[PDB]
Design a protein around this motif. Structure first.
Motif, PDB file in Angstrom:
ATOM      1  N   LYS A 231      -5.070  35.976  15.217  1.00 30.20           N
ATOM      2  CA  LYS A 231      -3.819  35.317  15.451  1.00 30.20           C
ATOM      3  C   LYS A 231      -2.728  36.263  15.815  1.00 30.20           C
ATOM      4  N   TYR A 232      -1.922  35.938  17.015  1.00 31.87           N
ATOM      5  CA  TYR A 232      -0.799  36.772  17.300  1.00 31.87           C
ATOM      6  C   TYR A 232       0.571  36.146  17.130  1.00 31.87           C
ATOM      7  N   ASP A 233       1.246  36.232  18.112  1.00 29.74           N
ATOM      8  CA  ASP A 233       2.590  35.627  18.201  1.00 29.74           C
ATOM      9  C   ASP A 233       2.709  34.865  19.453  1.00 29.74           C
TER      10      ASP A 233
ATOM     11  N   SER B 176       6.280  21.964  22.016  1.00 28.93           N
ATOM     12  CA  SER B 176       5.351  21.261  20.963  1.00 28.93           C
ATOM     13  C   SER B 176       4.333  20.360  21.688  1.00 28.93           C
ATOM     14  N   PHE B 177       3.405  19.829  21.000  1.00 26.59           N
ATOM     15  CA  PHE B 177       2.473  19.072  21.382  1.00 26.59           C
ATOM     16  C   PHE B 177       2.934  17.659  21.670  1.00 26.59           C
ATOM     17  N   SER B 178       3.883  17.396  20.745  1.00 29.35           N
ATOM     18  CA  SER B 178       4.538  15.983  20.741  1.00 29.35           C
ATOM     19  C   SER B 178       5.227  15.785  21.865  1.00 29.35           C
TER      20      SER B 178
ATOM     21  N   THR C  63      -7.964  19.790  13.151  1.00 35.39           N
ATOM     22  CA  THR C  63      -8.520  21.148  13.069  1.00 35.39           C
ATOM     23  C   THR C  63      -7.225  22.155  12.710  1.00 35.39           C
ATOM     24  N   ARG C  64      -5.948  21.265  12.063  1.00 39.78           N
ATOM     25  CA  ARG C  64      -4.805  21.916  11.612  1.00 39.78           C
ATOM     26  C   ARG C  64      -4.390  22.980  12.988  1.00 39.78           C
ATOM     27  N   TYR C  65      -4.080  22.257  14.036  1.00 41.12           N
ATOM     28  CA  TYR C  65      -3.258  22.963  15.085  1.00 41.12           C
ATOM     29  C   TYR C  65      -1.707  22.647  14.754  1.00 41.12           C
ATOM     30  N   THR C  66      -1.038  24.011  15.116  1.00 36.59           N
ATOM     31  CA  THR C  66       0.445  23.758  14.753  1.00 36.59           C
ATOM     32  C   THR C  66       1.193  24.219  15.933  1.00 36.59           C
ATOM     33  N   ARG C  67       1.168  24.994  16.379  1.00 31.94           N
ATOM     34  CA  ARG C  67       2.009  25.141  17.658  1.00 31.94           C
ATOM     35  C   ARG C  67       1.135  25.847  18.959  1.00 31.94           C
ATOM     36  N   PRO C  68       1.443  25.347  20.157  1.00 31.70           N
ATOM     37  CA  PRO C  68       0.826  25.831  21.305  1.00 31.70           C
ATOM     38  C   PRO C  68       0.662  27.370  21.655  1.00 31.70           C
ATOM     39  N   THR C  69      -0.298  28.086  21.787  1.00 32.14           N
ATOM     40  CA  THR C  69      -0.386  29.291  21.928  1.00 32.14           C
ATOM     41  C   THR C  69       0.445  29.667  23.539  1.00 32.14           C
ATOM     42  N   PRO C  70       0.730  30.929  23.909  1.00 31.01           N
ATOM     43  CA  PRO C  70       1.331  31.210  25.035  1.00 31.01           C
ATOM     44  C   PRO C  70       0.874  30.465  26.188  1.00 31.01           C
ATOM     45  N   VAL C  71      -0.615  30.734  26.556  1.00 32.56           N
ATOM     46  CA  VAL C  71      -1.213  30.245  27.696  1.00 32.56           C
ATOM     47  C   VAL C  71      -1.102  28.935  27.440  1.00 32.56           C
ATOM     48  N   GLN C  72      -1.319  28.084  26.298  1.00 35.81           N
ATOM     49  CA  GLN C  72      -1.277  26.683  26.329  1.00 35.81           C
ATOM     50  C   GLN C  72      -0.052  26.192  26.652  1.00 35.81           C
ATOM     51  N   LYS C  73       1.187  26.865  26.268  1.00 33.32           N
ATOM     52  CA  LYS C  73       2.549  26.168  26.448  1.00 33.32           C
ATOM     53  C   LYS C  73       2.555  26.109  28.008  1.00 33.32           C
TER      54      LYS C  73
ATOM     55  N   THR D  79      -5.030  39.014  27.701  1.00 33.10           N
ATOM     56  CA  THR D  79      -4.326  39.264  25.934  1.00 33.10           C
ATOM     57  C   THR D  79      -3.751  37.589  25.743  1.00 33.10           C
ATOM     58  N   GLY D  80      -4.462  36.618  26.085  1.00 32.10           N
ATOM     59  CA  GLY D  80      -3.801  35.321  25.873  1.00 32.10           C
ATOM     60  C   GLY D  80      -4.952  34.503  24.850  1.00 32.10           C
ATOM     61  N   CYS D  81      -4.311  34.103  23.815  1.00 33.21           N
ATOM     62  CA  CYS D  81      -5.086  33.230  22.899  1.00 33.21           C
ATOM     63  C   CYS D  81      -5.044  31.869  22.987  1.00 33.21           C
ATOM     64  N   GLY D  82      -6.180  31.114  22.692  1.00 33.88           N
ATOM     65  CA  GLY D  82      -6.442  29.774  23.142  1.00 33.88           C
ATOM     66  C   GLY D  82      -6.438  29.481  24.856  1.00 33.88           C
ATOM     67  N   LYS D  83      -7.255  30.260  25.363  1.00 34.79           N
ATOM     68  CA  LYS D  83      -7.300  30.106  26.914  1.00 34.79           C
ATOM     69  C   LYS D  83      -8.520  29.014  26.987  1.00 34.79           C
TER      70      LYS D  83
ATOM     71  N   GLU E 261     -18.550  23.830  21.385  1.00 32.32           N
ATOM     72  CA  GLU E 261     -18.296  23.562  20.257  1.00 32.32           C
ATOM     73  C   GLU E 261     -16.945  23.160  20.110  1.00 32.32           C
ATOM     74  N   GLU E 262     -15.683  23.613  20.439  1.00 26.05           N
ATOM     75  CA  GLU E 262     -14.499  23.149  20.733  1.00 26.05           C
ATOM     76  C   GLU E 262     -14.384  21.816  21.675  1.00 26.05           C
ATOM     77  N   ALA E 263     -15.272  21.419  22.575  1.00 23.48           N
ATOM     78  CA  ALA E 263     -15.242  20.267  23.090  1.00 23.48           C
ATOM     79  C   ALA E 263     -15.730  19.238  22.123  1.00 23.48           C
ATOM     80  N   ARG E 264     -16.812  19.473  21.502  1.00 27.71           N
ATOM     81  CA  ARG E 264     -17.248  18.535  20.445  1.00 27.71           C
ATOM     82  C   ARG E 264     -16.073  18.231  19.334  1.00 27.71           C
ATOM     83  N   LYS E 265     -15.145  19.193  19.242  1.00 29.30           N
ATOM     84  CA  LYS E 265     -14.157  18.896  18.225  1.00 29.30           C
ATOM     85  C   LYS E 265     -13.006  17.947  18.763  1.00 29.30           C
ATOM     86  N   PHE E 266     -12.921  17.793  20.012  1.00 29.97           N
ATOM     87  CA  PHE E 266     -11.882  16.983  20.704  1.00 29.97           C
ATOM     88  C   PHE E 266     -12.376  15.907  21.277  1.00 29.97           C
TER      89      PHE E 266
HETATM   90  C1  FPJ Z   1      -6.034  35.945  20.884  1.00 33.21           C
HETATM   91  C2  FPJ Z   1      -7.388  34.908  20.519  1.00 33.21           C
HETATM   92  C3  FPJ Z   1      -8.050  34.854  21.876  1.00 33.21           C
HETATM   93  O1  FPJ Z   1      -8.150  35.690  22.781  1.00 33.21           O
HETATM   94  N1  FPJ Z   1      -9.022  33.797  21.914  1.00 33.21           N
HETATM   95  P1  FPJ Z   1      -9.574  32.651  20.440  1.00 33.21           P
HETATM   96  O2  FPJ Z   1      -9.530  33.580  19.253  1.00 33.21           O
HETATM   97  O3  FPJ Z   1     -10.939  32.185  20.743  1.00 33.21           O
HETATM   98  O4  FPJ Z   1      -8.741  31.444  20.308  1.00 33.21           O
HETATM   99  C4  FPJ Z   1      -9.491  30.006  20.203  1.00 33.21           C
HETATM  100  C5  FPJ Z   1      -9.759  29.999  18.666  1.00 33.21           C
HETATM  101  O5  FPJ Z   1      -8.526  29.728  17.977  1.00 33.21           O
HETATM  102  C6  FPJ Z   1      -8.248  28.453  17.512  1.00 33.21           C
HETATM  103  N2  FPJ Z   1      -7.065  28.015  18.280  1.00 33.21           N
HETATM  104  C7  FPJ Z   1      -6.685  27.872  19.545  1.00 33.21           C
HETATM  105  N3  FPJ Z   1      -5.521  27.482  19.862  1.00 33.21           N
HETATM  106  C8  FPJ Z   1      -5.016  26.893  18.400  1.00 33.21           C
HETATM  107  C9  FPJ Z   1      -3.864  26.695  18.274  1.00 33.21           C
HETATM  108  N4  FPJ Z   1      -2.747  26.387  19.239  1.00 33.21           N
HETATM  109  N5  FPJ Z   1      -3.528  26.455  16.909  1.00 33.21           N
HETATM  110  C10 FPJ Z   1      -4.479  26.764  15.887  1.00 33.21           C
HETATM  111  N6  FPJ Z   1      -5.666  27.486  16.273  1.00 33.21           N
HETATM  112  C11 FPJ Z   1      -5.971  27.392  17.652  1.00 33.21           C
HETATM  113  C12 FPJ Z   1      -9.699  27.503  18.367  1.00 33.21           C
HETATM  114  O6  FPJ Z   1     -10.079  26.786  17.176  1.00 33.21           O
HETATM  115  C13 FPJ Z   1     -10.625  28.644  18.515  1.00 33.21           C
HETATM  116  O7  FPJ Z   1     -11.498  28.772  17.562  1.00 33.21           O
END
Ligand code: FPJ
Length: 427
Positions: A22-24, A41-43, A58-68, A86-90, A136-141
């Protein structure tokens, strides 16, 4: 009729399988016509109780850059073209808004007036690895909701996936080769597919999936551009992608995460002059310097060459298999499993025989022979490298490759790679 916005009865037996764990932040360049600004924020956006409740689990806190940026764009029924390596949460960047709309709008009158599966949303992926991650993330939501997701991929039992589909799917994740295979069997219909997502579109083109992706999107009952909502995600951006994003998207917005350009990085490219007589020797030295278990993929241009070259490496003691069409599906699918895990860490192949085969992410690509088009070269060297570590792509060049001299040269300079000094003196 029924309702798809009220959470169903929960089941503690089901939280155990889903939420056991996880990055920033980095710059963005969201260029688009009249697009809505992002959220923090998601709210902020009212996505729905079934989504909000599942977000907490799933303990989601803040939306990632691309999610924002991407989340408000999608729920506003706007086509999206997100280019972010380089985008988390794609992946969750599109799942949350898509499923939020399905819970709100419902399945449509076409499905409720029924009792061959017709999915509402379709996500295309290049690899079995990435397909299951989205599934697997689809099943989660989709938990506690009336949406049941299904995943299919190549190199597996097709009968067990057919038995999985008939159980009912509304959100289908698929690789392009296996989805086309399902459609010919009359198991899947794209007539009411409202949401289309092409995840890692660049690597999907590098594996030779375009004829399938265009057969799926442009040559069937898939609703037209404008009717459907289409998102695209990719790391690179060649001429192949922008032309594809032009045909598949209607007045879209372009997203960018910092370094955005064609020719994926994490891939070091070396070009050396090797006459045809010395290619065998050069390849031997290139293999004697290889890491202990580094997976290697060796492209050649003909079927006879691939057989003669594999025979060469086996008579030298190297553990190698081959895939070149002249060996039936019993030996080819066996070569994958043998290559996917040690055993034969050297896979000799042709460009055609590797189309649509999920190669187990090689570490070193060797173009024993070069193609005649710089676009095929991008495909071949795209088989290596990931979002993390660095890969290597060595290419044997000689007088049979003057055709691609200029294009290879400019490609190297754009990729900020070392350029052979003699290559400049050939254009
Ligand atoms: C830089 C990370 C990347 O490139 N992709 P990733 O590691 O597959 O990111 C998705 C995984 O991290 C969890 N996730 C995604 N978004 C969030 C937020 N907003 N909060 C907490 N966790 C998150 C997903 O569960 C997935 O496993």
């Amino acid at each position: 009729e029924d309702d798809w916005s009220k959470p169903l009865p929960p089941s503690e037996r089901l939280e155990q399988e889903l939420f056991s764990g996880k990055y920033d932040d980095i710059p963005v360049e969201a260029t688009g016509n009249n697009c809505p600004p992002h959220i923090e924020s998601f709210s902020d956006v009212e996505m729905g109780e079934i989504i909000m409740g599942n977000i907490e689990l799933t303990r989601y806190t803040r939306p990632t850059p691309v999610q924002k940026h991407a989340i408000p764009i999608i729920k506003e029924k706007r086509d999206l073209m997100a280019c972010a390596q380089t985008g988390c949460g794609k992946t969750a960047a599109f799942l949350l808004p898509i499923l939020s709309q399905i819970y709100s709008d419902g399945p449509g009158e076409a499905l409720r007036a029924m009792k061959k599966q017709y999915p509402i949303s379709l996500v295309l992926a290049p690899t079995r690895e990435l397909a299951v991650q989205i599934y697997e993330e689809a099943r989660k939501f989709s938990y506690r909701s009336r949406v049941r997701p299904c995943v299919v991929y190549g190199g597996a039992d097709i009968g067990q996936q057919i038995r999985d589909l008939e159980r009912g799917c509304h959100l289908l994740v698929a690789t392009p080769g296996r989805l086309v295979d399902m459609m010919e069997r009359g198991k899947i219909g794209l007539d009411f597919c409202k949401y289309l997502v092409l995840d890692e579109a660049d690597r999907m083109l590098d594996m030779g999936f375009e004829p399938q992706i265009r057969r799926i999107v442009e040559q069937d009952t898939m609703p037209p551009k404008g009717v459907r909502h289409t998102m695209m995600f990719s790391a690179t951006f060649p001429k192949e992608i922008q032309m594809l994003a032009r045909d598949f998207l209607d007045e879209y917005i372009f997203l960018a995460v910092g370094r955005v350009g064609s020719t994926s990085e994490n891939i070091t490219q070396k070009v050396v002059w090797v006459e045809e007589s010395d290619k065998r020797s050069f390849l031997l030295d290139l293999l004697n310097a290889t890491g202990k278990d580094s997976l290697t993929l060796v492209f050649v241009e003909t079927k006879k060459g691939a057989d003669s070259l594999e025979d060469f490496l086996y008579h030298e003691g190297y553990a190698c298999t081959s895939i070149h069409g002249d060996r039936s599906q019993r030996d080819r699918e066996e070569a994958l499993h043998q290559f996917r895990s040690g055993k034969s860490p050297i896979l000799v192949a042709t460009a055609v025989a590797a189309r649509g085969l999920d190669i187990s992410n090689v570490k070193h690509v060797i173009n024993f022979d070069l193609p005649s088009d710089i676009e095929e070269y991008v495909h071949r060297i795209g088989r290596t490298g990931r979002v993390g570590n660095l890969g290597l792509a060595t290419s044997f060049f000689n007088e049979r490759n003057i055709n691609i001299t200029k294009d290879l040269l400019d490609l190297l300079v754009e990729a900020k790679q070392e350029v052979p000094s003699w290559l400049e003196n050939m254009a």
